[PDB]
Amino acid sequence: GSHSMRYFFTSVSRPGRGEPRFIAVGYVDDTQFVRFDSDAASQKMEPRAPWIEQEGPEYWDQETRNMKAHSQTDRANLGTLRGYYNQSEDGSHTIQIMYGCDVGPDGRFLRGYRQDAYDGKDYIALNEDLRSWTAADMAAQITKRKWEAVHAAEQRRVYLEGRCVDGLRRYLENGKETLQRTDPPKTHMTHHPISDHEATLRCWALGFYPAEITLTWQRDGEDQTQDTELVETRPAGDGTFQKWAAVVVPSGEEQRYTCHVQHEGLPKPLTLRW
């Protein structure tokens, strides 16, 4: 169906230990494809997907520029924000930028994003209309009004409607075997007695993509919010993800509970029993 491209930038200032360190990462849907580390040896944006290196030298020395410039901009921004709240040069602070775009099944445009954060808290964001911004604090108000003066939202808009959808299109069709893949969650149940009167049933869903998932335990088909446990979906370390959901059953009543797995790379929602 729909698809996404996100760029996550984090730059944290190292006071005393030279310059700030700066990390950036690119994702298409739930699949990373590029990397750059300030502490890296290559000092150049590296590939982590198999389809992105069919792009020639036109591209690596391009984005390496686009993003070292962003690195120095984030440095100066670290100083500016250090002054904005009367903060001390001794402390270590962080700046993070998320931006990207969404496409539909036809490759249409539906949404673009850009959000900034200072020390984990939101600073300034550009709204869904790509016209105005929101300022969380009152320093994001000076950054805001200054950006309204130079019409920065129009430049973030020409990017988000331009090359973000172009790049997302190109990458969607270029890693076609890898990016429109799925994996119907390989599921399996588990039974572990604790008392002579209670056990635990663990509904397992492993190897699935995209991360989107829904595990639901039911009793007599009644949704169970009571004695359950639900992990957060974990990366299985190989582009696919894992998850499980446990419930505590009175012994001899295991066959009254049913696990229901709702993955979308999968035609009909599952129902498992002991």
Binding site: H70, N77, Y84, A152
Partner: peptide, 10 residues
């Protein structure tokens, strides 16, 4: 492709 980051100083 990322942005020609330019109108983005605080």
């Amino acid at each position: 492709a990322q942005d020609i980051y330019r109108a983005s100083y605080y």
